[PDB]
Amino acid sequence: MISLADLQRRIETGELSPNAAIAQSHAAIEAREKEVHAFVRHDKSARAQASGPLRGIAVGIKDIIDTANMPTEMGSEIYRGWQPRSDAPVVMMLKRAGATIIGKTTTTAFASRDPTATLNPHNTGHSPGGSSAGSAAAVGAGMIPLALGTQTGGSVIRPAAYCGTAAIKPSFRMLPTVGVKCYSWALDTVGLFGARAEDLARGLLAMTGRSEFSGIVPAKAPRIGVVRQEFAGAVEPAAEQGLQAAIKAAERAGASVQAIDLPEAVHEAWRIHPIIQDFEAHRALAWEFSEHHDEIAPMLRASLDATVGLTPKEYDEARRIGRRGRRELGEVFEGVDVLLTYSAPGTAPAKALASTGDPRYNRLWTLMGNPCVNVPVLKVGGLPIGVQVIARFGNDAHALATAWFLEDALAK
Amino acid sequence: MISLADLQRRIETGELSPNAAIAQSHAAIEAREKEVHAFVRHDKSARAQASGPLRGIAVGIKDIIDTANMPTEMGSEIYRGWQPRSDAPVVMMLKRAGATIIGKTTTTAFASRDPTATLNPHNTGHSPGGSSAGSAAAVGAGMIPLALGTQTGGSVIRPAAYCGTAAIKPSFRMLPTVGVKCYSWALDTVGLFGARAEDLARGLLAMTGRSEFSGIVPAKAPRIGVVRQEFAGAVEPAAEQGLQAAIKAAERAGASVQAIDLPEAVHEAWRIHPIIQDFEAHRALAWEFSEHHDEIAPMLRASLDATVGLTPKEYDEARRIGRRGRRELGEVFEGVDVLLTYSAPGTAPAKALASTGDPRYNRLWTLMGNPCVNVPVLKVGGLPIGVQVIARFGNDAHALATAWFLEDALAK
């Protein structure tokens, strides 16, 4: 994988040149696209910019995020050829910092369950996950140093884990969703994929100019609370293997690790996530569902068909539960600095299964809103396995710091 | 003005057919549109639907709200001829309910300060307000029974007051802002324009399907708390005359009224509203500001050019202040059912002033998120004056009921 921070340093000292950096990505992409299929379209003519901390940095953008110079097809035939007039605010944050929008990465139709044609970089016979399939795969294939994705359920953390890349879903609403196809406005959150926690930090800094992302350093003696989300069902061995590997490394590194169960109110929040997501999806995709029903990809069309009867009443109650869940979650952070849990059910599923994977271990946090970071840990049978690092709402910086601490810990 | 509730009742009993109802609107639009100029576009072929609670009901749509079959030009040359792919969810809520989208109504460029060419229905020498100029003007001129607008500061309540129409800015995020050109995602709220409070209720009931909007009836001996928002400065005579008149009509109607001071924390919220708004505006209109700076309407261009320096730090500080204001504000509602205040600084300004009016008496409530309803009280010099009925967050039904009560109180 390509490191964003690495490129920056090398370019900042004049050791490396922006055009060279960009030329590399163009090469890297051409080197494996026929193998990975992580891009809907690649702008071969894309060139580096003259100034800014991100000059020389190639960025892939999930195709539900508006671009003014390239189509934004939503991973759906309904939007084949569709061309937004403007660039989404998050895209502008990148361009204003000097980034090079190198192409649009694949997304499942309307960022839901329907698999894309993208293949896992580590094993072409497996899925790269969803819905931010291309952003994770392209970064995992060393095609680009950065990529934007989105998460409603687990569309950022899970695919990152599956593809062995670092990634973060910032605190809810920190990054605007303007110009980003909505699935569920109560959940949709923009995310970044990179090589390491550090790369993610430098990215958010460039995009937001927020001091908290400036000079982030690995955390020291982190207070960690491990939650296995029993309420989310049974996990796969490989996943537990990764979590234990991470806990062991962290303890050796000086972290105080303690297992903990989540409040009952949090369990409930995890359970009603689908209610909020699907009820809102019906409003958010009302036009598509009403005028182009049969054109909506199979799986999404099915989940929508099955939920046409969700009511405003049960939806309001679902949101009440969500609020209760957040409140009692904050209390959990009185004792620990971060929570550690699985990033996915296990290794990425074979493409033959026609599944991007179950987001059951990701959804809760998207609803709570806390910042989440995927930390690549190990690989079972060649397929990557990671762990999810979660901090208090609004403390994305500490999440990346601890995620960084953890990365070095695993590096022995 | 055309009453939505009235048309519904007559269509229901069979007294009026949906086709005839829509024909009535096309005609009502034809009759005054040349003198008012409330529509960017009037779809003369728009027909009524056969079923639904809103069959035979024509609705004007503020032009920053996406429509699939008509252009959405955002009141700006930058988006001339811009055609959205999908209808915004709120639009779909109307269509799915059986309504007819009869046209797009004027909006100031990107919903800010730059006046539209629309004229006040009560006196063409005056402003209809803004930024939802056309929606207030069209309903006020008796062209349509309903219209959608938005409010970041006072874009719904103020123009409604100026044009003498009933209107509601529902609780924050109750209506989705998907497909609605964003100015400030922390503030942007969709609102409705109608003849009376009851027409609003019927509109929200059909759009949301929420029971709290079903069977609404005038409130009885409501407990009212009068707030003059001194932090905003003194209001113009006409505005006070209208307020003083509403209090007396209410008291004589059986309601208990009392002057109340707003928590200092709330005053501060009003004060920092501009920071949140302007700071976000810079991210929301990033593409426009960077790629088409000089094409931005003069006034908005000036306010943006003057706030480029706002920082993430002061921004977050303002959001913290806003949240504190929300908490302490809820307290106020433990003693009183609704608050009663001004809708605008006074009567509509003369067009020659090149101003859509000062939003200072509207902005706080948009940040607080409480549902607000404008009640037309009287007219000075032939120009309408209203008062703003405000209920605690999520208590929209009570806001409409009290507004309905007040409407009757004034009819004596």
Side-chain angles (χ1 to χ4, degrees), chain A residues 78 82 85-86 89 95-96 173 210 283 286-287 290-291 316, chain B residues 78 85-86 89 95-96 173 185 210 283 286 290-291 316:
Chain A
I78 297 175
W82 174 243
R85 177 88 172 92
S86 60
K95 303 205 312 176
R96 289 187 163 188
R173 303 189 74 182
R210 304 183 64 119
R283 272 68 263 172
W287 177 79
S290 294
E291 319 291 6
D316 291 331
Chain B
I78 296 165
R85 176 56 170 145
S86 52
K95 306 208 310 172
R96 286 181 168 195
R173 285 184 291 190
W185 61 83
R210 308 185 65 181
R283 312 319 136 199
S290 297
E291 308 284 19
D316 297 314

PDB file of all heavy atoms in Angstrom, chain A residues 78 82 85-86 89 95-96 173 210 283 286-287 290-291 316, chain B residues 78 85-86 89 95-96 173 185 210 283 286 290-291 316:
ATOM      1  N   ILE A  78     -29.706   3.265 -13.108  1.00  0.00           N
ATOM      2  CA  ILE A  78     -30.626   4.388 -13.076  1.00  0.00           C
ATOM      3  C   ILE A  78     -29.869   5.686 -13.270  1.00  0.00           C
ATOM      4  O   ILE A  78     -30.398   6.647 -13.826  1.00  0.00           O
ATOM      5  CB  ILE A  78     -31.381   4.419 -11.729  1.00  0.00           C
ATOM      6  CG1 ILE A  78     -32.223   3.143 -11.590  1.00  0.00           C
ATOM      7  CG2 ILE A  78     -32.241   5.662 -11.639  1.00  0.00           C
ATOM      8  CD1 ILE A  78     -32.925   2.980 -10.241  1.00  0.00           C
ATOM      9  N   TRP A  82     -24.972   9.870 -15.470  1.00  0.00           N
ATOM     10  CA  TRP A  82     -25.334  11.047 -14.676  1.00  0.00           C
ATOM     11  C   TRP A  82     -24.134  11.925 -14.338  1.00  0.00           C
ATOM     12  O   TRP A  82     -23.107  11.439 -13.866  1.00  0.00           O
ATOM     13  CB  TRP A  82     -26.027  10.614 -13.379  1.00  0.00           C
ATOM     14  CG  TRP A  82     -26.310  11.758 -12.447  1.00  0.00           C
ATOM     15  CD1 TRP A  82     -25.796  11.942 -11.192  1.00  0.00           C
ATOM     16  CD2 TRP A  82     -27.154  12.887 -12.704  1.00  0.00           C
ATOM     17  NE1 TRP A  82     -26.268  13.115 -10.656  1.00  0.00           N
ATOM     18  CE2 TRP A  82     -27.103  13.715 -11.561  1.00  0.00           C
ATOM     19  CE3 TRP A  82     -27.949  13.278 -13.792  1.00  0.00           C
ATOM     20  CZ2 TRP A  82     -27.817  14.915 -11.471  1.00  0.00           C
ATOM     21  CZ3 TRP A  82     -28.663  14.477 -13.702  1.00  0.00           C
ATOM     22  CH2 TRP A  82     -28.589  15.277 -12.549  1.00  0.00           C
ATOM     23  N   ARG A  85     -23.493  18.776 -11.354  1.00  0.00           N
ATOM     24  CA  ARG A  85     -23.011  20.074 -11.781  1.00  0.00           C
ATOM     25  C   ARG A  85     -21.799  20.479 -10.948  1.00  0.00           C
ATOM     26  O   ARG A  85     -20.852  21.069 -11.463  1.00  0.00           O
ATOM     27  CB  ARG A  85     -24.108  21.122 -11.608  1.00  0.00           C
ATOM     28  CG  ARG A  85     -23.692  22.551 -11.964  1.00  0.00           C
ATOM     29  CD  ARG A  85     -23.906  22.874 -13.438  1.00  0.00           C
ATOM     30  NE  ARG A  85     -23.669  24.288 -13.710  1.00  0.00           N
ATOM     31  CZ  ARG A  85     -22.500  24.807 -14.089  1.00  0.00           C
ATOM     32  NH1 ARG A  85     -21.438  24.025 -14.258  1.00  0.00           N
ATOM     33  NH2 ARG A  85     -22.385  26.118 -14.283  1.00  0.00           N
ATOM     34  N   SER A  86     -21.830  20.142  -9.661  1.00  0.00           N
ATOM     35  CA  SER A  86     -20.759  20.525  -8.746  1.00  0.00           C
ATOM     36  C   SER A  86     -20.046  19.379  -8.050  1.00  0.00           C
ATOM     37  O   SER A  86     -20.474  18.234  -8.112  1.00  0.00           O
ATOM     38  CB  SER A  86     -21.329  21.441  -7.673  1.00  0.00           C
ATOM     39  OG  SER A  86     -22.334  20.753  -6.957  1.00  0.00           O
ATOM     40  N   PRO A  89     -18.938  18.943  -1.222  1.00  0.00           N
ATOM     41  CA  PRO A  89     -18.067  19.693  -0.320  1.00  0.00           C
ATOM     42  C   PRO A  89     -16.841  18.911   0.158  1.00  0.00           C
ATOM     43  O   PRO A  89     -15.767  19.492   0.294  1.00  0.00           O
ATOM     44  CB  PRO A  89     -19.016  20.083   0.800  1.00  0.00           C
ATOM     45  CG  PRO A  89     -20.270  20.400   0.020  1.00  0.00           C
ATOM     46  CD  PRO A  89     -20.357  19.229  -0.939  1.00  0.00           C
ATOM     47  N   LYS A  95      -9.602  18.981  -2.941  1.00  0.00           N
ATOM     48  CA  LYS A  95      -9.045  19.812  -4.006  1.00  0.00           C
ATOM     49  C   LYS A  95      -8.427  21.106  -3.472  1.00  0.00           C
ATOM     50  O   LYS A  95      -7.359  21.530  -3.923  1.00  0.00           O
ATOM     51  CB  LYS A  95     -10.118  20.145  -5.040  1.00  0.00           C
ATOM     52  CG  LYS A  95     -10.778  18.927  -5.669  1.00  0.00           C
ATOM     53  CD  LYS A  95     -11.352  19.254  -7.042  1.00  0.00           C
ATOM     54  CE  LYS A  95     -12.188  20.525  -7.023  1.00  0.00           C
ATOM     55  NZ  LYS A  95     -12.684  20.905  -8.381  1.00  0.00           N
ATOM     56  N   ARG A  96      -9.090  21.724  -2.499  1.00  0.00           N
ATOM     57  CA  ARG A  96      -8.582  22.960  -1.922  1.00  0.00           C
ATOM     58  C   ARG A  96      -7.248  22.738  -1.212  1.00  0.00           C
ATOM     59  O   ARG A  96      -6.466  23.673  -1.050  1.00  0.00           O
ATOM     60  CB  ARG A  96      -9.598  23.548  -0.944  1.00  0.00           C
ATOM     61  CG  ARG A  96     -10.840  24.125  -1.614  1.00  0.00           C
ATOM     62  CD  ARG A  96     -11.712  24.847  -0.605  1.00  0.00           C
ATOM     63  NE  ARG A  96     -12.668  25.738  -1.251  1.00  0.00           N
ATOM     64  CZ  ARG A  96     -13.445  26.595  -0.599  1.00  0.00           C
ATOM     65  NH1 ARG A  96     -13.385  26.671   0.721  1.00  0.00           N
ATOM     66  NH2 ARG A  96     -14.262  27.395  -1.272  1.00  0.00           N
ATOM     67  N   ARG A 173     -21.465  13.477  11.384  1.00  0.00           N
ATOM     68  CA  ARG A 173     -21.628  14.850  10.921  1.00  0.00           C
ATOM     69  C   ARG A 173     -20.408  15.760  10.996  1.00  0.00           C
ATOM     70  O   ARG A 173     -20.545  16.978  10.846  1.00  0.00           O
ATOM     71  CB  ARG A 173     -22.798  15.522  11.655  1.00  0.00           C
ATOM     72  CG  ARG A 173     -24.124  14.790  11.503  1.00  0.00           C
ATOM     73  CD  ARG A 173     -25.295  15.596  12.054  1.00  0.00           C
ATOM     74  NE  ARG A 173     -25.642  16.716  11.180  1.00  0.00           N
ATOM     75  CZ  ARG A 173     -26.606  17.599  11.434  1.00  0.00           C
ATOM     76  NH1 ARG A 173     -27.326  17.500  12.547  1.00  0.00           N
ATOM     77  NH2 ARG A 173     -26.859  18.574  10.568  1.00  0.00           N
ATOM     78  N   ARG A 210      -8.331  21.182  11.176  1.00  0.00           N
ATOM     79  CA  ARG A 210      -8.562  21.156  12.612  1.00  0.00           C
ATOM     80  C   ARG A 210      -7.283  20.749  13.334  1.00  0.00           C
ATOM     81  O   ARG A 210      -6.678  19.723  13.012  1.00  0.00           O
ATOM     82  CB  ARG A 210      -9.705  20.192  12.915  1.00  0.00           C
ATOM     83  CG  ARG A 210     -10.963  20.558  12.148  1.00  0.00           C
ATOM     84  CD  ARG A 210     -12.118  19.652  12.487  1.00  0.00           C
ATOM     85  NE  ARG A 210     -12.511  19.794  13.882  1.00  0.00           N
ATOM     86  CZ  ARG A 210     -13.708  20.205  14.284  1.00  0.00           C
ATOM     87  NH1 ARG A 210     -14.642  20.523  13.398  1.00  0.00           N
ATOM     88  NH2 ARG A 210     -13.975  20.277  15.579  1.00  0.00           N
ATOM     89  N   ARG A 283     -37.692   6.932   2.366  1.00  0.00           N
ATOM     90  CA  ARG A 283     -37.950   8.344   2.087  1.00  0.00           C
ATOM     91  C   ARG A 283     -36.828   8.874   1.188  1.00  0.00           C
ATOM     92  O   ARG A 283     -37.076   9.614   0.235  1.00  0.00           O
ATOM     93  CB  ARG A 283     -37.954   9.178   3.383  1.00  0.00           C
ATOM     94  CG  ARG A 283     -39.283   9.298   4.131  1.00  0.00           C
ATOM     95  CD  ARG A 283     -39.756   8.000   4.743  1.00  0.00           C
ATOM     96  NE  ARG A 283     -40.713   7.328   3.873  1.00  0.00           N
ATOM     97  CZ  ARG A 283     -41.184   6.102   4.081  1.00  0.00           C
ATOM     98  NH1 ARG A 283     -40.784   5.406   5.138  1.00  0.00           N
ATOM     99  NH2 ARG A 283     -42.053   5.573   3.225  1.00  0.00           N
ATOM    100  N   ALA A 286     -37.194   7.500  -2.321  1.00  0.00           N
ATOM    101  CA  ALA A 286     -38.597   7.472  -2.722  1.00  0.00           C
ATOM    102  C   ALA A 286     -38.784   7.580  -4.238  1.00  0.00           C
ATOM    103  O   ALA A 286     -39.576   6.841  -4.821  1.00  0.00           O
ATOM    104  CB  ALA A 286     -39.363   8.587  -2.013  1.00  0.00           C
ATOM    105  N   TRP A 287     -38.059   8.500  -4.868  1.00  0.00           N
ATOM    106  CA  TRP A 287     -38.166   8.693  -6.309  1.00  0.00           C
ATOM    107  C   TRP A 287     -37.764   7.435  -7.076  1.00  0.00           C
ATOM    108  O   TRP A 287     -38.475   6.991  -7.983  1.00  0.00           O
ATOM    109  CB  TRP A 287     -37.283   9.858  -6.756  1.00  0.00           C
ATOM    110  CG  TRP A 287     -37.292  10.065  -8.242  1.00  0.00           C
ATOM    111  CD1 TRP A 287     -38.258  10.692  -8.978  1.00  0.00           C
ATOM    112  CD2 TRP A 287     -36.302   9.614  -9.180  1.00  0.00           C
ATOM    113  NE1 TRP A 287     -37.934  10.658 -10.315  1.00  0.00           N
ATOM    114  CE2 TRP A 287     -36.742  10.002 -10.468  1.00  0.00           C
ATOM    115  CE3 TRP A 287     -35.089   8.919  -9.059  1.00  0.00           C
ATOM    116  CZ2 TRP A 287     -36.009   9.716 -11.629  1.00  0.00           C
ATOM    117  CZ3 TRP A 287     -34.361   8.637 -10.213  1.00  0.00           C
ATOM    118  CH2 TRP A 287     -34.827   9.036 -11.482  1.00  0.00           C
ATOM    119  N   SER A 290     -40.290   4.593  -6.465  1.00  0.00           N
ATOM    120  CA  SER A 290     -41.578   4.848  -7.102  1.00  0.00           C
ATOM    121  C   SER A 290     -41.544   4.859  -8.623  1.00  0.00           C
ATOM    122  O   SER A 290     -42.456   4.351  -9.267  1.00  0.00           O
ATOM    123  CB  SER A 290     -42.149   6.193  -6.632  1.00  0.00           C
ATOM    124  OG  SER A 290     -42.477   6.164  -5.251  1.00  0.00           O
ATOM    125  N   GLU A 291     -40.498   5.444  -9.193  1.00  0.00           N
ATOM    126  CA  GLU A 291     -40.394   5.565 -10.642  1.00  0.00           C
ATOM    127  C   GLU A 291     -39.479   4.566 -11.341  1.00  0.00           C
ATOM    128  O   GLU A 291     -39.601   4.358 -12.550  1.00  0.00           O
ATOM    129  CB  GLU A 291     -39.927   6.976 -10.999  1.00  0.00           C
ATOM    130  CG  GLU A 291     -40.559   8.082 -10.179  1.00  0.00           C
ATOM    131  CD  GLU A 291     -42.031   8.269 -10.465  1.00  0.00           C
ATOM    132  OE1 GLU A 291     -42.606   7.463 -11.228  1.00  0.00           O
ATOM    133  OE2 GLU A 291     -42.615   9.234  -9.922  1.00  0.00           O
ATOM    134  N   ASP A 316     -40.102   6.433  15.209  1.00  0.00           N
ATOM    135  CA  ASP A 316     -39.814   7.401  16.264  1.00  0.00           C
ATOM    136  C   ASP A 316     -39.299   6.687  17.496  1.00  0.00           C
ATOM    137  O   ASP A 316     -38.353   7.147  18.140  1.00  0.00           O
ATOM    138  CB  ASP A 316     -41.051   8.213  16.638  1.00  0.00           C
ATOM    139  CG  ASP A 316     -41.482   9.155  15.539  1.00  0.00           C
ATOM    140  OD1 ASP A 316     -40.606   9.606  14.758  1.00  0.00           O
ATOM    141  OD2 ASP A 316     -42.695   9.454  15.469  1.00  0.00           O
TER     142      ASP A 316
ATOM    143  N   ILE B  78     -25.561  30.472 -11.959  1.00  0.00           N
ATOM    144  CA  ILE B  78     -24.630  29.350 -11.958  1.00  0.00           C
ATOM    145  C   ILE B  78     -25.361  28.044 -12.267  1.00  0.00           C
ATOM    146  O   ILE B  78     -24.801  27.146 -12.887  1.00  0.00           O
ATOM    147  CB  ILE B  78     -23.907  29.233 -10.599  1.00  0.00           C
ATOM    148  CG1 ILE B  78     -23.049  30.482 -10.373  1.00  0.00           C
ATOM    149  CG2 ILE B  78     -23.046  27.978 -10.573  1.00  0.00           C
ATOM    150  CD1 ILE B  78     -22.569  30.667  -8.949  1.00  0.00           C
ATOM    151  N   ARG B  85     -31.721  14.848 -11.357  1.00  0.00           N
ATOM    152  CA  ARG B  85     -32.138  13.537 -11.827  1.00  0.00           C
ATOM    153  C   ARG B  85     -33.389  13.060 -11.090  1.00  0.00           C
ATOM    154  O   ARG B  85     -34.327  12.537 -11.694  1.00  0.00           O
ATOM    155  CB  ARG B  85     -30.996  12.537 -11.619  1.00  0.00           C
ATOM    156  CG  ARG B  85     -31.327  11.099 -11.979  1.00  0.00           C
ATOM    157  CD  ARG B  85     -31.807  10.955 -13.414  1.00  0.00           C
ATOM    158  NE  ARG B  85     -31.899   9.552 -13.815  1.00  0.00           N
ATOM    159  CZ  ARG B  85     -32.821   9.068 -14.641  1.00  0.00           C
ATOM    160  NH1 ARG B  85     -33.743   9.870 -15.158  1.00  0.00           N
ATOM    161  NH2 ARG B  85     -32.819   7.778 -14.956  1.00  0.00           N
ATOM    162  N   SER B  86     -33.406  13.263  -9.778  1.00  0.00           N
ATOM    163  CA  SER B  86     -34.523  12.811  -8.965  1.00  0.00           C
ATOM    164  C   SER B  86     -35.300  13.900  -8.250  1.00  0.00           C
ATOM    165  O   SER B  86     -34.817  15.023  -8.070  1.00  0.00           O
ATOM    166  CB  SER B  86     -34.020  11.816  -7.922  1.00  0.00           C
ATOM    167  OG  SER B  86     -32.919  12.355  -7.206  1.00  0.00           O
ATOM    168  N   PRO B  89     -36.857  13.933  -1.691  1.00  0.00           N
ATOM    169  CA  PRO B  89     -37.777  13.156  -0.859  1.00  0.00           C
ATOM    170  C   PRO B  89     -39.038  13.918  -0.429  1.00  0.00           C
ATOM    171  O   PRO B  89     -40.136  13.370  -0.499  1.00  0.00           O
ATOM    172  CB  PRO B  89     -36.900  12.749   0.312  1.00  0.00           C
ATOM    173  CG  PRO B  89     -35.598  12.504  -0.358  1.00  0.00           C
ATOM    174  CD  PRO B  89     -35.463  13.695  -1.281  1.00  0.00           C
ATOM    175  N   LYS B  95     -46.057  13.963  -3.861  1.00  0.00           N
ATOM    176  CA  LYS B  95     -46.527  13.192  -5.007  1.00  0.00           C
ATOM    177  C   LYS B  95     -47.162  11.872  -4.572  1.00  0.00           C
ATOM    178  O   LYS B  95     -48.223  11.492  -5.062  1.00  0.00           O
ATOM    179  CB  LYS B  95     -45.374  12.910  -5.974  1.00  0.00           C
ATOM    180  CG  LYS B  95     -44.608  14.143  -6.436  1.00  0.00           C
ATOM    181  CD  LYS B  95     -43.988  13.941  -7.820  1.00  0.00           C
ATOM    182  CE  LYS B  95     -43.190  12.646  -7.912  1.00  0.00           C
ATOM    183  NZ  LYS B  95     -42.743  12.326  -9.308  1.00  0.00           N
ATOM    184  N   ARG B  96     -46.513  11.170  -3.652  1.00  0.00           N
ATOM    185  CA  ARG B  96     -47.042   9.903  -3.182  1.00  0.00           C
ATOM    186  C   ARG B  96     -48.355  10.094  -2.448  1.00  0.00           C
ATOM    187  O   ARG B  96     -49.135   9.161  -2.310  1.00  0.00           O
ATOM    188  CB  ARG B  96     -46.043   9.212  -2.259  1.00  0.00           C
ATOM    189  CG  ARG B  96     -44.849   8.603  -2.972  1.00  0.00           C
ATOM    190  CD  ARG B  96     -43.934   7.935  -1.969  1.00  0.00           C
ATOM    191  NE  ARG B  96     -42.923   7.103  -2.612  1.00  0.00           N
ATOM    192  CZ  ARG B  96     -42.201   6.193  -1.971  1.00  0.00           C
ATOM    193  NH1 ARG B  96     -42.381   6.004  -0.666  1.00  0.00           N
ATOM    194  NH2 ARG B  96     -41.311   5.460  -2.633  1.00  0.00           N
ATOM    195  N   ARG B 173     -35.088  18.622  11.285  1.00  0.00           N
ATOM    196  CA  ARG B 173     -34.948  17.293  10.710  1.00  0.00           C
ATOM    197  C   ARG B 173     -36.161  16.383  10.674  1.00  0.00           C
ATOM    198  O   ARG B 173     -36.015  15.188  10.422  1.00  0.00           O
ATOM    199  CB  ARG B 173     -33.773  16.555  11.362  1.00  0.00           C
ATOM    200  CG  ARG B 173     -32.429  17.075  10.876  1.00  0.00           C
ATOM    201  CD  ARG B 173     -31.257  16.294  11.426  1.00  0.00           C
ATOM    202  NE  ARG B 173     -31.093  16.501  12.858  1.00  0.00           N
ATOM    203  CZ  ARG B 173     -30.039  16.086  13.554  1.00  0.00           C
ATOM    204  NH1 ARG B 173     -29.048  15.441  12.944  1.00  0.00           N
ATOM    205  NH2 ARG B 173     -29.978  16.316  14.860  1.00  0.00           N
ATOM    206  N   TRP B 185     -26.033  22.899   6.955  1.00  0.00           N
ATOM    207  CA  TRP B 185     -26.674  21.644   7.335  1.00  0.00           C
ATOM    208  C   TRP B 185     -27.103  21.586   8.796  1.00  0.00           C
ATOM    209  O   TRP B 185     -27.958  20.794   9.165  1.00  0.00           O
ATOM    210  CB  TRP B 185     -25.770  20.446   6.994  1.00  0.00           C
ATOM    211  CG  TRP B 185     -24.439  20.431   7.691  1.00  0.00           C
ATOM    212  CD1 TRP B 185     -24.174  19.978   8.953  1.00  0.00           C
ATOM    213  CD2 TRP B 185     -23.195  20.918   7.168  1.00  0.00           C
ATOM    214  NE1 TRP B 185     -22.842  20.153   9.248  1.00  0.00           N
ATOM    215  CE2 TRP B 185     -22.218  20.729   8.172  1.00  0.00           C
ATOM    216  CE3 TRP B 185     -22.811  21.499   5.949  1.00  0.00           C
ATOM    217  CZ2 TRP B 185     -20.876  21.101   7.992  1.00  0.00           C
ATOM    218  CZ3 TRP B 185     -21.473  21.869   5.773  1.00  0.00           C
ATOM    219  CH2 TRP B 185     -20.526  21.667   6.790  1.00  0.00           C
ATOM    220  N   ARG B 210     -47.858  10.875   9.996  1.00  0.00           N
ATOM    221  CA  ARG B 210     -47.754  10.840  11.454  1.00  0.00           C
ATOM    222  C   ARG B 210     -49.071  11.207  12.144  1.00  0.00           C
ATOM    223  O   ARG B 210     -49.693  12.223  11.838  1.00  0.00           O
ATOM    224  CB  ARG B 210     -46.637  11.777  11.919  1.00  0.00           C
ATOM    225  CG  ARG B 210     -45.319  11.531  11.206  1.00  0.00           C
ATOM    226  CD  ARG B 210     -44.214  12.388  11.773  1.00  0.00           C
ATOM    227  NE  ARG B 210     -43.924  12.026  13.157  1.00  0.00           N
ATOM    228  CZ  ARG B 210     -43.013  12.629  13.909  1.00  0.00           C
ATOM    229  NH1 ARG B 210     -42.300  13.631  13.408  1.00  0.00           N
ATOM    230  NH2 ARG B 210     -42.811  12.232  15.158  1.00  0.00           N
ATOM    231  N   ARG B 283     -18.341  25.628   3.451  1.00  0.00           N
ATOM    232  CA  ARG B 283     -18.085  24.245   3.036  1.00  0.00           C
ATOM    233  C   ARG B 283     -19.186  23.804   2.080  1.00  0.00           C
ATOM    234  O   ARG B 283     -18.928  23.093   1.111  1.00  0.00           O
ATOM    235  CB  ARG B 283     -18.079  23.256   4.218  1.00  0.00           C
ATOM    236  CG  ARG B 283     -17.266  23.652   5.430  1.00  0.00           C
ATOM    237  CD  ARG B 283     -15.950  24.268   5.060  1.00  0.00           C
ATOM    238  NE  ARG B 283     -15.730  25.434   5.898  1.00  0.00           N
ATOM    239  CZ  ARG B 283     -14.872  26.406   5.626  1.00  0.00           C
ATOM    240  NH1 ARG B 283     -14.132  26.366   4.527  1.00  0.00           N
ATOM    241  NH2 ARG B 283     -14.770  27.426   6.459  1.00  0.00           N
ATOM    242  N   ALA B 286     -18.589  25.449  -1.312  1.00  0.00           N
ATOM    243  CA  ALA B 286     -17.178  25.429  -1.679  1.00  0.00           C
ATOM    244  C   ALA B 286     -16.924  25.441  -3.187  1.00  0.00           C
ATOM    245  O   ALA B 286     -16.117  26.225  -3.675  1.00  0.00           O
ATOM    246  CB  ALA B 286     -16.502  24.222  -1.046  1.00  0.00           C
ATOM    247  N   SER B 290     -15.191  28.658  -5.012  1.00  0.00           N
ATOM    248  CA  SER B 290     -13.896  28.447  -5.647  1.00  0.00           C
ATOM    249  C   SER B 290     -13.893  28.510  -7.172  1.00  0.00           C
ATOM    250  O   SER B 290     -13.006  29.114  -7.772  1.00  0.00           O
ATOM    251  CB  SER B 290     -13.320  27.088  -5.220  1.00  0.00           C
ATOM    252  OG  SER B 290     -13.086  27.037  -3.828  1.00  0.00           O
ATOM    253  N   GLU B 291     -14.889  27.891  -7.789  1.00  0.00           N
ATOM    254  CA  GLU B 291     -14.976  27.815  -9.242  1.00  0.00           C
ATOM    255  C   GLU B 291     -15.800  28.898  -9.927  1.00  0.00           C
ATOM    256  O   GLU B 291     -15.607  29.170 -11.112  1.00  0.00           O
ATOM    257  CB  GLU B 291     -15.568  26.464  -9.643  1.00  0.00           C
ATOM    258  CG  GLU B 291     -14.899  25.248  -9.039  1.00  0.00           C
ATOM    259  CD  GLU B 291     -13.589  24.923  -9.704  1.00  0.00           C
ATOM    260  OE1 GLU B 291     -13.018  25.815 -10.365  1.00  0.00           O
ATOM    261  OE2 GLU B 291     -13.127  23.771  -9.559  1.00  0.00           O
ATOM    262  N   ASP B 316     -16.656  25.258  16.384  1.00  0.00           N
ATOM    263  CA  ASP B 316     -17.021  24.275  17.402  1.00  0.00           C
ATOM    264  C   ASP B 316     -17.511  24.968  18.659  1.00  0.00           C
ATOM    265  O   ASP B 316     -18.451  24.512  19.311  1.00  0.00           O
ATOM    266  CB  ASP B 316     -15.828  23.387  17.778  1.00  0.00           C
ATOM    267  CG  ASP B 316     -15.314  22.560  16.617  1.00  0.00           C
ATOM    268  OD1 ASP B 316     -16.136  21.951  15.895  1.00  0.00           O
ATOM    269  OD2 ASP B 316     -14.078  22.508  16.437  1.00  0.00           O
TER     270      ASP B 316
END
